[PDB]
Structures are given as structure tokens and as C-alpha cells.
Design a protein around this ligand. Sequence first.
Ligand SMILES: CC[C@H](C)c1cc(C(=O)N[C@@H]2CNCCC[C@H]2OC(=O)c2ccc(C(=O)c3cc(OC)ccc3O)cc2)ccc1O
Length: 338
Amino acid sequence: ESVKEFLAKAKEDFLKKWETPSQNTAQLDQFDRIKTLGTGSFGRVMLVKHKESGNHYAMKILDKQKVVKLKQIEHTLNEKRILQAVNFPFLVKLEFSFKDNSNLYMVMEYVAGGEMFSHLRRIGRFSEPHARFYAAQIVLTFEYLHSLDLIYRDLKPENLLIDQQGYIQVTDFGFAKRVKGRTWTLCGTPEYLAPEIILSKGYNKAVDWWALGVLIYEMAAGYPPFFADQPIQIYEKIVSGKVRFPSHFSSDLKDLLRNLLQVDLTKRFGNLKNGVNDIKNHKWFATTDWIAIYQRKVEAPFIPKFKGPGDTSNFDDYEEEEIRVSINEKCGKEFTEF
Ligand SMILES: CC[C@H](C)c1cc(C(=O)N[C@@H]2CNCCC[C@H]2OC(=O)c2ccc(C(=O)c3cc(OC)ccc3O)cc2)ccc1O
């Protein structure tokens, strides 16, 4: 349909930004750090405040020496380059980027509402209308990113942030990559890994539709379809499939999930012929108005309450360490783009 015009338009904007990336749009001295609020292999996300404007931001700080040692230079650069190039209603907007002698910095938009993980864990499990509202936003998110030949690869409650309006903001593009065809990297989180990733096949975008199948189950059930203590046991359960559904699951959920959690790649929804429309036109999505959810005209089933003032009460506690920038420049040749 007419949605192709939009996608044509999005391909034009992304590629101009993808070919000539925004490098060094700010510096560290322009911010005040307030609180460490995230943690990953090579850094932390910190709540900061822009001295001149007064606007709060998230600021991921990654240290070059740990990125190079662990060997994840390509992932780090992928993340930055996709983030400055993309533009979508359910994606966290990279506002600024820069680096220095020791670290890489990505100053993103402050999403006051926190992770989907916390809220899911608080109320146990979402209602199928509630899971649907979220899943709809992720279907449109993956339609956009897969148009742009981008694969996301880490879809899970923790990387989805609920904003003021109850709408999702997708963050953590560390494992995200631009590829036409297949990739061979062992990327993702165990419970979400598609069987072709586990069996070390060259996988494509269908991996993101398997991940959507696991997430919708986890939103409506309150636990993942494939779970165990050791990761090896979770991998045995995924390659077989055998997804036993909760009895409270409707027939429309059970069918959609059997199609997204389809172990055979060539028969999985979103990957076969019709594309994203196999999913858009499913009976579990019959009540979703795909344009009204895009325009954010649908009433959210959960407005996530907050402290009030830009950082007042606060949320989760982490050890506050120094943002250390050494006298000399570390690994600068490797990160010449930032
Ligand atoms: C201000 C708070 C609000 C809610 C806020 C938070 C984030 C956000 O992305 N926070 C995430 C919330 N999800 C779970 C992970 C923890 C945290 O992200 C990080 O702290 C973080 C993640 C990864 C890495 C990292 O080392 C990394 C690793 C890679 O390969 C393994 C590749 C790329 C990487 O960047 C560093 C920090 C974004 C915007 C926000 O307004």
C-alpha cells in the first residue's frame, strides 16, 4: 500500500546521515553528571544535565581500552552510526555524540518512566490488550529498521523504555547491525536467541521476529517460553521449539506465537513472502489501528508514574565511579569515527 512512500522517504534520510555521520556534536564539559543509571560490558548510562539549556539526558560512557580488549570495536561503531542515522517514534533519539582520550560518549534522550522489565516484574504479567499495544509498536519499529537493512538483535524487556505517555522507546543498539542478507555473529540474550543463531547458521532479520514472539509470550505470561538455569538447557528447548502455552492464552495469541516461534526459518512470520503483513493482518492484531498507534493517538493502558521534577526521587542505585579521561589518547586510531 501507500506506506512504501514513507519507507522511501525514510531510506533517503537514513542514507544521507548513514553516509556522512554526525561526529563530535558536544563535549563533556557541557554537562553535569547526576546519577549512574545503567551498566554494560564497557561502561554505564548516566543521568546528566546540560548546563546551558537545563535539559536532562542519558549519557552512555564507553571506555576505549575495554572495547578494544574484548574486541567489540565494530559493535560500538555500529551502534553510534545507526543511532545518528535513524529516526522513528519508538526509538530513543541520540541527541549528541563525541569522544576523548579514554572514552566514547553517546548523549541520548531522557526517558522518564524506566525499563519495561521493571513494570512487567511489578505487575506479574500484562493483559493481552496491554501486550498488544507494545507489540504493535515493535512490529512498526522492526518494519522501519528492516526497510533500512538494519537488524536489531537484542529485543527484550530491559532494552525497551516506557516514556511519559506509556509508549515504548527502543534503546541498546549495541548488537544492531546493517546487513543485506546474513550475519554470523553470536549476538543477543540466551532466552531470545533464534535457533539459527544457536546452531551458528548465517541468520537474517527473521531473528528479530522470533525475538518478538518470545517477548509477546513473556509480556502475556510473565515469564519466557524457554527458560532454565544453565544457558545450554535454554538452547536445547529453543532448537526443538515445543512451546507450551499458558491456559489463559487466547487462541489468537497461541496461533501468532506458533508462527513467530517457528523454528523453521523459511516458514516464520515476518520472514516468508508477505513480510510484516502476515503479522499486521493476524487476528490477534484485528483491533490494532496501525496508523493511530504510530501517530500515538491510541490511549495507553499504563501511564508509568514518576518523581515529578527532572530527577527528584530517583530510581536504581549503582556505585558512582569517576569519569576518568587520561592525559594521553587511548585507542584513537581504532575509533577515528565518533
Ligand atoms: C538515563 C536512564 C534512562 C532510562 C535511559 C537509559 C538508556 C539506556 O540505554 N539504558 C540501558 C537500559 N537497558 C539495560 C542496559 C543498561 C542501560 O544501558 C547501559 O547502561 C549500557 C549498555 C551497554 C553498554 C555497553 O558496554 C555496550 C556493549 C556492547 O557490546 C557487548 C556494545 C555497545 C555497548 O554500548 C554500556 C552501557 C537510554 C536512554 C535513557 O533515557
